[PDB]
Amino acid sequence: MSSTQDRSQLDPEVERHTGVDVEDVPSAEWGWSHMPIGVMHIGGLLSAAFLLVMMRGNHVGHVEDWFLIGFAAVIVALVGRNWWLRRRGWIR
Amino acid sequence: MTSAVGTSGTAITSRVHSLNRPNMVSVGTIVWLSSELMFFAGLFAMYFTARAQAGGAWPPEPTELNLALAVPVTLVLIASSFTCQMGVFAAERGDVFGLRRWYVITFLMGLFFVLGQGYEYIHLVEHGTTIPGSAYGSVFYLATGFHGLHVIGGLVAFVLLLARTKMSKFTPAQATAAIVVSYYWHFVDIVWIALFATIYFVR
Amino acid sequence: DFAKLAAAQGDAIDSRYHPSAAVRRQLNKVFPTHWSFLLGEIALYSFIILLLTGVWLTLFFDPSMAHVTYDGVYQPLRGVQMSRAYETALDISFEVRGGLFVRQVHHWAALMFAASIMVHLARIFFTGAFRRPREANWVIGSLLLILAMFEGFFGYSLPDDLLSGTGIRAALSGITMGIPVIGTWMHWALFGGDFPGEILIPRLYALHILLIPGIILALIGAHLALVWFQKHTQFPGPGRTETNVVGVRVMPVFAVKSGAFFAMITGVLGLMGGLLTINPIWNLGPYKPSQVSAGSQPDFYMMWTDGLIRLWPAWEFYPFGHTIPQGVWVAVGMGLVFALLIAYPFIEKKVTGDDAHHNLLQRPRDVPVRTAIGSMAIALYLLLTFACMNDIIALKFHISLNATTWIGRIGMVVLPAIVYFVAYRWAISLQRSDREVLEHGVETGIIKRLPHGAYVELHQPLGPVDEHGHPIPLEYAGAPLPKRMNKLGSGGAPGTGSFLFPDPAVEHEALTEAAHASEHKSLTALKEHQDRIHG
Amino acid sequence: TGVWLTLFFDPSMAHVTYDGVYQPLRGVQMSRAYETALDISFEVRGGLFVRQVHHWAALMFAASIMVHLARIFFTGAFRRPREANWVIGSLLLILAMFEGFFGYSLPDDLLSGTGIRAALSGITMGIPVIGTWMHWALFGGDFPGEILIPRLYALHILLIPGII
Amino acid sequence: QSALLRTGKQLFETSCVSCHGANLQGVPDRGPSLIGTGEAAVYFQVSTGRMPAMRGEAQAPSKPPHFDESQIDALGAYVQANGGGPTVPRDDHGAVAQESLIGGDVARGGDLFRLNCASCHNFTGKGGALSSGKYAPDLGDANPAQIYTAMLTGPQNMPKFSDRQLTPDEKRDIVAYVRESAETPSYGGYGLGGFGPAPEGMAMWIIGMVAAIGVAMWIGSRA
Amino acid sequence: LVAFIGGLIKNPWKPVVPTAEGKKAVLWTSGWTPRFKGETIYLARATGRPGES
Ligand SMILES: CC(C)=CCC/C(C)=C/CC/C(C)=C\CC/C(C)=C/CC/C(C)=C/CC/C(C)=C/CC/C(C)=C\CC/C(C)=C/CC/C(C)=C/CC1=C(C)C(=O)c2ccccc2C1=O
Ligand SMILES: CCCCCCCCCCCCCCCC(=O)O[C@H](COC(=O)CCCCCCC[C@@H](C)CCCCCCCCC)COP(=O)(O)O[C@H]1[C@H](O)[C@H](O)[C@H](O)[C@@H](O)[C@@H]1O
Ligand SMILES: CCCCCCCCCCCCCCCC(=O)O[C@H](COC(=O)CCCCCCC[C@@H](C)CCCCCCCCC)COP(=O)(O)O[C@H]1[C@H](O)[C@H](O)[C@H](O)[C@@H](O)[C@@H]1O
Ligand SMILES: CCCCCCCCCCCCCCCC(=O)O[C@H](COC(=O)CCCCCCC[C@@H](C)CCCCCCCCC)COP(=O)(O)O[C@H]1[C@H](O)[C@H](O)[C@H](O)[C@@H](O)[C@@H]1O
Ligand code: HEM
Ligand code: HEM
């Protein structure tokens, strides 16, 4: 009970219109709170493309290329599922 | 604030109640004590065989097994049991200072037990057996050495609960914590009565 | 003759100069008392140690590459060819009284320096202490990190013990030759010859006593001037609006805790400069270019660099009659990360739209993508470091060496994505965890409801309550809200007596009533100031 | 200039034969301070000029300090407001003098090596009680004690010019 | 003694002929050939404990010894009578010489350990990583005769530094170095391993920097 | 600025080391190269003896 209230008038801000609403994340006006989602889609897809480029090198152990195919197919599957759900509006 | 909604004696409550209700950290440490007794059953079974194996004069030739330093530290530890029980008598009646004096001297002579056991290990390894040196030396170093880890963990519980008595109001929850650490460590030095009867007297 | 002479000399100082205006402006300056605002002081407080040891190390170290046989005291190096840098570094280790300690506490002060710079960069990153008014302060602090890293690398390579001589061969001469157009030219300009070119170690000694620490001292001076005059930032709290700094003043309180924290940083460095060996150059050898260790790993603040060599997967190019080797990439890559670490506030000023003069900090849960980009950078650093001791990890933690460098080589691509996901959603769930402590209360022990069988957690509200089981839900204010009634005034009254013996009860009553009234007066004065700001 | 002279000068007393370009010193034993000061003089492009304008800047420095001390003395610029300014300027003259003496002795050309033998080791031994002790603390050994020239290089790049 | 050869054969039949074929041959892709390796090789490979092993993996690691010194002479003389190669150096008692092997020089041993092999292990003889799962082991728990017979017949992935590659003066000199580099205490503090900067970093963070941030949070408040 | 840098800028491709072809630069020249024609370059080990042979 030995506490006071807290009141902070910041400089609130794009200016509070485009981004994420304050009910998706519970504090969106208090800082930068939404990466644009094409950036993370193309970042995952480019990450998986980089893991597929990583076959090209000094290389005799093909037990590694199955890990590269695996961690590339997982990222391509997550990016494709995520983009497909936003193309259908989070359905199935 | 307005006043509070959780208008209790502290932020910590007892554990349920203890007038017409069993104390729950009490029964928790009792069944965990019983589990650790089965852990010591594992260590005792690692002792009572590899003594049926060695025949004749079976505690081997480098093991001049010192009883004249063993029985003083057992006497220290079991008198320290009564100091710790006097500490919990001074914990039921609610004063932190009667708790802290008897648990400080219980921690000090439990530390004296740990240092006496460590000096017994030094004095018994420098002109005798090692844990890869013998069967009996190895089982002596593990059946009582991990008991050394039990009592050093109990000492950690003592110093930890003493800092806990430094930092908050003495609630009945903290008397529950005190009685729980009290007869955890009473279990430690009743297992050490069992081990001291087993290793040194009975052999 | 002790206060009268103080008054006489004070009136003499006020007679000669006129300082008291611009002294009262200084010792009424307020610094806020948050703990993280001491972190960068470690990067100051070890750095002075790096002078106070390092000056001492200058007047015994003899840089050269003239090859001398040892003929001293250390028996496993006798009659062996060594550079005179290594020979007089052995003389610092073994001849001079308390010499190994001063050079070890010097190396440990270098580690605490280049590690507290990283800790403090984490502070001012994740708390958002770098946007509009302090972005040039971020830039000169970032350059100060670069100079710290390169100057420490010039540091432990300054004796040419071969564990760091192979570090010069890897980093400072394999990457420097491996730059496409002007690579060999800047190599042969930096060395004056081949790799054991006879004017490398004195050039590093020249750059390492004065020429880089002169720039480091100039940037620390301008840096603490930017922190000083342009006022310090603060977390938002009770009486903490955008245009004030609350905390303690310099003269009674902050000077005492700052000097004491300097003394305790020096205590930690002295304890770990004595009790722990560092750079045991006698166990190492003189640098001869035909013998290596197995570790051959740099100091930790630069282990992300050649760990990035250890993980970049051998991609070389061959134009018409020439060669781009692997070492170009990390020469790009270290030029990449620094260009993201210098110029970050302008990057997210472009991305977000923060065109506002920010003085209050933002808690690192309140800004989830920036905390998540930061945790990408933290975990990418931890990966590039934790796969630079690739060798000794695969040694001790029994892993195939190829397997752990493939773990790093995939980890630098997928583990920033994993830690971005976990960091972003973990920041949002830390937001939601202290946005339900307002709509509900603070959690405690359980009461049952009386006439029926229910279980309510008996929440304790933080603001004003309504007539029923729910309070008026407060708004968020960027403050750390307490989630334990423990940390409120609940059960926080032990016996005041001693650790062993109680004080009499009237003294206990006086002490707890006086301390309770002082804490009540603290929150009363802060609350009425907060009402003075808005009312 | 002086920063530029730091990244070519190699202080030592390890005795090297020259084997460079300068013909009247070939195969002659020299300290590596003198050898790389010869390399500043003759190897590097515009090196003799930078070290000469460095020595002339040292002369104009330690002479203009004396000219300016004559100014603020004879014009009376040192009384009640500014006697502490006189004191720190005087100490700055002392550090200028001792630091330049560490300067032209930093290559051990023998015209200044005999200057170290006269001034920095004959007067230093010639102090009654603690003279030999501060001599053997300053040199670490005899007069060509192998850690004199790097100690002067240490005091002469940073430790005295930091105070200056 | 022929009874000593018979004792070596009795221990040979009942420990290894699933992987050495009982004619001292090599069981193909299960255990290599064994003639010519000799008494020195069997002394190092059973006196350390390694070769009475249990799987064919990246490399067969160290373990407790499966036979004692009264039987290693039997087993090594049996493999030298069937094959023949390097022998373990023995003193004027006929037993395995372990103390007469430390040479009279250390600095030559320091430079020669450092040039010829300390690439693989470490400077003081701690372990080092190797290519595919295999690793150099620590030299601290190493009998000097095992060190001489380790470099004399190189077991797994190490070159056999022969009697003519390194002379026995040089090999006694290297085992003089490693038994007074893995035995001498770390001058000036706790030895954070033997290899420098990565344990020094990890003990900067959780020992030094965690204590520094703990002091910094005890001094400053939080708000 | 060129007076600062001109003392540093060495040409790595100035022919310095004598070789059998003539004077080659340093990067194309180890100590394994012949100096005039086929000369005996012995593949000698380094017995780590302090100075004598
Ligand atoms: C804050 C963040 C760096 C954002 C910057 C902006 C970013 C976008 C710039 C681009 C960076 C990206 C592209 C590449 C990453 C490269 C990287 C950042 C190199 C720059 C150097 C520097 C800035 C490194 C980051 C700062 C550093 C990691 C902060 C320390 C971590 C935390 C927050 C401090 C508290 C930790 C403290 C309490 C000790 C806890 C103990 C833990 C186990 C320490 C972890 C740990 C560490 C961190 C070691 O360095 C280390 C080195 C050698 C051996 C062991 C360890 C070790 O165990
Ligand atoms: C602090 C806790 C950290 C916990 C991290 C736990 C690690 C996660 C899982 C790791 C799985 C490792 C499996 C490796 C098993 C293996 O040995 O496979 C090798 C190579 O595989 C690989 O590495 C591929 C696996 C890569 C893993 C993917 C990385 C995931 C990221 C997210 C983990 C990074 C974590 C880093 C933490 C740092 C801190 C961050 C905060 C094949 O090469 P190799 O063995 O040498 O050659 C063969 C001959 O030996 C053999 O005789 C012959 O038969 C041939 O096969 C031949 O090729
Ligand atoms: C108080 C009065 C002042 C007294 C001075 C106090 C300062 C200490 C220096 C005094 C001399 C002690 C150093 C001894 C000399 C010495 O170097 O210390 C060795 C290191 O050994 C070990 O580790 C075993 C030690 C285990 C003890 C506990 C480990 C220390 C921990 C706490 C360090 C924390 C590091 C951070 C953890 C990271 C966090 C991860 C999440 C131990 O030697 P030793 O055991 O006998 O044999 C070696 C073989 O370990 C060695 O494998 C062999 O190769 C040979 O070196 C052999 O000589
Ligand atoms: C910090 C600012 C960075 C600005 C860099 C750009 C500015 C460049 C200005 C320099 C122009 C040339 C100056 C005179 C030079 C000249 O005439 O160039 C001759 C043949 O080069 C050429 O034409 C090629 C010239 C093109 C320059 C290429 C190098 C550019 C940069 C990238 C190199 C990095 C340098 C700075 C980093 C080093 C860090 C140091 C801490 C050398 O033949 P050489 O036969 O070796 O003659 C030797 C005497 O030069 C020499 O002093 C003497 O010492 C003798 O050794 C003598 O042999
Ligand atoms: C800017 C911060 C500095 C850092 C991070 C730093 C770092 C280092 C490091 C890591 C070493 C190696 C120590 C060892 O392992 O033996 C070193 C050595 C040295 N330091 Fe610094 N240093 C700094 C500033 C200075 C300053 C300002 C001076 C002198 C005024 C100085 C003088 C020396 C000398 C002469 C050596 C070499 C002697 C030796 O290594 O034994 N250092 N430095
Ligand atoms: C404080 C004012 C200074 C004075 C009066 C001074 C004086 C001198 C003198 C007289 C010499 C001898 C030059 C010669 O005849 O070759 C010298 C050499 C030198 N100066 Fe200074 N110096 C000063 C500051 C500095 C600074 C600040 C640095 C470096 C950052 C520096 C670096 C050097 C070096 C390395 C040498 C020796 C190289 C050589 O003599 O060829 N000096 N100095």
mmCIF file of C-alpha atoms in Angstrom, chain C residues 286-439:
data_model
loop_
_atom_site.group_PDB
_atom_site.id
_atom_site.type_symbol
_atom_site.label_atom_id
_atom_site.label_comp_id
_atom_site.label_asym_id
_atom_site.label_seq_id
_atom_site.Cartn_x
_atom_site.Cartn_y
_atom_site.Cartn_z
ATOM 1 C CA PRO C 286 57.849 -16.119 -28.073
ATOM 2 C CA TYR C 287 56.177 -15.607 -31.405
ATOM 3 C CA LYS C 288 57.834 -17.774 -33.996
ATOM 4 C CA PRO C 289 55.814 -18.249 -37.199
ATOM 5 C CA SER C 290 56.097 -22.050 -37.271
ATOM 6 C CA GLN C 291 54.392 -22.923 -33.973
ATOM 7 C CA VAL C 292 50.828 -22.354 -32.747
ATOM 8 C CA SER C 293 48.483 -23.289 -29.922
ATOM 9 C CA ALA C 294 45.221 -25.134 -30.454
ATOM 10 C CA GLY C 295 43.050 -22.381 -29.000
ATOM 11 C CA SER C 296 44.566 -19.420 -30.898
ATOM 12 C CA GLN C 297 41.506 -17.403 -29.959
ATOM 13 C CA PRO C 298 41.522 -13.647 -29.409
ATOM 14 C CA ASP C 299 40.321 -11.687 -26.422
ATOM 15 C CA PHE C 300 36.586 -11.937 -25.928
ATOM 16 C CA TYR C 301 35.501 -8.492 -27.176
ATOM 17 C CA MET C 302 37.115 -9.409 -30.508
ATOM 18 C CA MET C 303 36.125 -13.102 -30.464
ATOM 19 C CA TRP C 304 33.071 -12.172 -32.503
ATOM 20 C CA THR C 305 35.400 -11.073 -35.310
ATOM 21 C CA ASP C 306 37.438 -14.150 -36.134
ATOM 22 C CA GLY C 307 34.643 -16.352 -34.893
ATOM 23 C CA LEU C 308 32.973 -14.714 -37.869
ATOM 24 C CA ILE C 309 36.030 -15.957 -39.770
ATOM 25 C CA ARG C 310 35.468 -19.401 -38.210
ATOM 26 C CA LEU C 311 31.850 -19.427 -39.403
ATOM 27 C CA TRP C 312 31.907 -17.747 -42.800
ATOM 28 C CA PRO C 313 31.756 -20.709 -45.181
ATOM 29 C CA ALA C 314 34.809 -20.302 -47.457
ATOM 30 C CA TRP C 315 33.321 -18.214 -50.267
ATOM 31 C CA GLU C 316 36.105 -16.830 -52.435
ATOM 32 C CA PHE C 317 35.861 -15.100 -55.798
ATOM 33 C CA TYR C 318 38.290 -15.142 -58.715
ATOM 34 C CA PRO C 319 38.026 -12.273 -61.200
ATOM 35 C CA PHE C 320 40.136 -11.936 -64.316
ATOM 36 C CA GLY C 321 43.549 -12.794 -62.922
ATOM 37 C CA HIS C 322 42.980 -11.866 -59.280
ATOM 38 C CA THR C 323 41.532 -13.222 -56.043
ATOM 39 C CA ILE C 324 39.003 -12.058 -53.482
ATOM 40 C CA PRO C 325 39.681 -14.321 -50.476
ATOM 41 C CA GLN C 326 37.419 -15.087 -47.520
ATOM 42 C CA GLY C 327 38.925 -12.313 -45.379
ATOM 43 C CA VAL C 328 37.326 -9.642 -47.574
ATOM 44 C CA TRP C 329 33.875 -10.687 -46.294
ATOM 45 C CA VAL C 330 34.577 -10.088 -42.617
ATOM 46 C CA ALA C 331 36.468 -6.948 -43.624
ATOM 47 C CA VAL C 332 33.135 -6.075 -45.177
ATOM 48 C CA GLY C 333 31.320 -7.653 -42.246
ATOM 49 C CA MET C 334 33.107 -5.768 -39.483
ATOM 50 C CA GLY C 335 32.568 -2.732 -41.679
ATOM 51 C CA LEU C 336 28.931 -3.786 -41.914
ATOM 52 C CA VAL C 337 28.088 -4.262 -38.214
ATOM 53 C CA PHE C 338 29.888 -1.070 -37.177
ATOM 54 C CA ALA C 339 27.953 0.848 -39.816
ATOM 55 C CA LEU C 340 24.826 -0.566 -38.207
ATOM 56 C CA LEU C 341 26.075 0.119 -34.692
ATOM 57 C CA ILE C 342 27.254 3.675 -35.253
ATOM 58 C CA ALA C 343 24.280 4.706 -37.358
ATOM 59 C CA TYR C 344 21.418 2.910 -35.584
ATOM 60 C CA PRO C 345 19.549 5.978 -34.120
ATOM 61 C CA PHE C 346 19.276 7.496 -37.568
ATOM 62 C CA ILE C 347 18.105 4.096 -38.868
ATOM 63 C CA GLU C 348 15.210 3.827 -36.500
ATOM 64 C CA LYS C 349 14.565 7.562 -36.688
ATOM 65 C CA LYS C 350 13.891 6.858 -40.354
ATOM 66 C CA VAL C 351 11.950 3.652 -39.667
ATOM 67 C CA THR C 352 9.788 4.631 -36.687
ATOM 68 C CA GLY C 353 9.330 8.372 -37.089
ATOM 69 C CA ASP C 354 10.762 9.502 -33.754
ATOM 70 C CA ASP C 355 11.114 13.188 -34.574
ATOM 71 C CA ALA C 356 10.616 14.179 -30.922
ATOM 72 C CA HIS C 357 12.933 15.357 -28.162
ATOM 73 C CA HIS C 358 12.901 12.314 -25.860
ATOM 74 C CA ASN C 359 14.296 12.656 -22.344
ATOM 75 C CA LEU C 360 12.343 10.019 -20.453
ATOM 76 C CA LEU C 361 13.543 6.520 -21.163
ATOM 77 C CA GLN C 362 11.358 3.696 -22.357
ATOM 78 C CA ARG C 363 11.432 0.428 -20.462
ATOM 79 C CA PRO C 364 12.753 -2.350 -22.733
ATOM 80 C CA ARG C 365 9.474 -4.216 -22.524
ATOM 81 C CA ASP C 366 7.619 -1.112 -23.770
ATOM 82 C CA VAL C 367 9.353 -1.236 -27.156
ATOM 83 C CA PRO C 368 9.203 -4.824 -28.366
ATOM 84 C CA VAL C 369 10.609 -4.790 -31.897
ATOM 85 C CA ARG C 370 13.549 -2.640 -30.883
ATOM 86 C CA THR C 371 14.243 -4.871 -27.892
ATOM 87 C CA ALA C 372 13.871 -7.830 -30.246
ATOM 88 C CA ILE C 373 16.290 -6.403 -32.848
ATOM 89 C CA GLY C 374 18.604 -5.771 -29.928
ATOM 90 C CA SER C 375 18.255 -9.319 -28.672
ATOM 91 C CA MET C 376 19.002 -10.498 -32.212
ATOM 92 C CA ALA C 377 22.222 -8.516 -31.963
ATOM 93 C CA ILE C 378 22.970 -9.785 -28.428
ATOM 94 C CA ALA C 379 22.395 -13.417 -29.337
ATOM 95 C CA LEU C 380 24.271 -13.037 -32.624
ATOM 96 C CA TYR C 381 27.209 -11.686 -30.620
ATOM 97 C CA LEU C 382 26.834 -14.580 -28.171
ATOM 98 C CA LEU C 383 26.798 -16.988 -31.093
ATOM 99 C CA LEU C 384 29.835 -15.521 -32.857
ATOM 100 C CA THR C 385 31.651 -15.532 -29.534
ATOM 101 C CA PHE C 386 30.396 -18.973 -28.404
ATOM 102 C CA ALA C 387 31.577 -20.408 -31.711
ATOM 103 C CA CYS C 388 34.966 -18.687 -31.480
ATOM 104 C CA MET C 389 35.918 -20.834 -28.512
ATOM 105 C CA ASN C 390 34.663 -23.487 -30.979
ATOM 106 C CA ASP C 391 37.969 -25.243 -30.366
ATOM 107 C CA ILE C 392 37.859 -25.477 -26.593
ATOM 108 C CA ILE C 393 34.079 -25.973 -26.461
ATOM 109 C CA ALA C 394 34.434 -29.031 -28.710
ATOM 110 C CA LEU C 395 37.371 -30.020 -26.518
ATOM 111 C CA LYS C 396 35.689 -29.905 -23.111
ATOM 112 C CA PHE C 397 31.989 -30.222 -23.921
ATOM 113 C CA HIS C 398 32.647 -33.282 -26.077
ATOM 114 C CA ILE C 399 31.213 -32.277 -29.468
ATOM 115 C CA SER C 400 32.627 -32.827 -32.938
ATOM 116 C CA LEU C 401 34.535 -29.691 -33.882
ATOM 117 C CA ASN C 402 32.965 -29.742 -37.329
ATOM 118 C CA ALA C 403 29.594 -30.173 -35.633
ATOM 119 C CA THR C 404 29.914 -27.138 -33.375
ATOM 120 C CA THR C 405 31.179 -24.909 -36.148
ATOM 121 C CA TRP C 406 28.219 -26.058 -38.248
ATOM 122 C CA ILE C 407 26.048 -25.307 -35.205
ATOM 123 C CA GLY C 408 27.496 -21.810 -35.278
ATOM 124 C CA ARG C 409 27.265 -21.573 -39.060
ATOM 125 C CA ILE C 410 23.541 -22.360 -38.985
ATOM 126 C CA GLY C 411 23.083 -20.566 -35.667
ATOM 127 C CA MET C 412 24.086 -17.159 -37.015
ATOM 128 C CA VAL C 413 21.298 -17.560 -39.585
ATOM 129 C CA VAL C 414 18.467 -19.155 -37.581
ATOM 130 C CA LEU C 415 19.118 -18.246 -33.906
ATOM 131 C CA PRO C 416 18.603 -14.486 -34.477
ATOM 132 C CA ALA C 417 15.229 -15.451 -35.961
ATOM 133 C CA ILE C 418 14.417 -17.653 -32.950
ATOM 134 C CA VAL C 419 15.563 -15.026 -30.475
ATOM 135 C CA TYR C 420 13.675 -12.335 -32.421
ATOM 136 C CA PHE C 421 10.468 -14.345 -32.096
ATOM 137 C CA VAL C 422 11.072 -15.111 -28.417
ATOM 138 C CA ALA C 423 12.241 -11.558 -27.678
ATOM 139 C CA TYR C 424 9.357 -9.780 -29.414
ATOM 140 C CA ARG C 425 6.648 -11.961 -27.941
ATOM 141 C CA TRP C 426 8.416 -12.045 -24.580
ATOM 142 C CA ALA C 427 8.495 -8.251 -24.462
ATOM 143 C CA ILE C 428 4.787 -8.163 -25.329
ATOM 144 C CA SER C 429 4.011 -10.711 -22.638
ATOM 145 C CA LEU C 430 6.088 -8.742 -20.134
ATOM 146 C CA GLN C 431 3.898 -5.793 -21.102
ATOM 147 C CA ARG C 432 0.750 -7.838 -20.574
ATOM 148 C CA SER C 433 2.092 -9.120 -17.254
ATOM 149 C CA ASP C 434 2.250 -5.545 -15.932
ATOM 150 C CA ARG C 435 -0.900 -4.449 -17.687
ATOM 151 C CA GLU C 436 -2.921 -7.006 -15.742
ATOM 152 C CA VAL C 437 -1.436 -5.821 -12.434
ATOM 153 C CA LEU C 438 -3.398 -2.594 -13.012
ATOM 154 C CA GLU C 439 -6.730 -3.998 -14.199
#
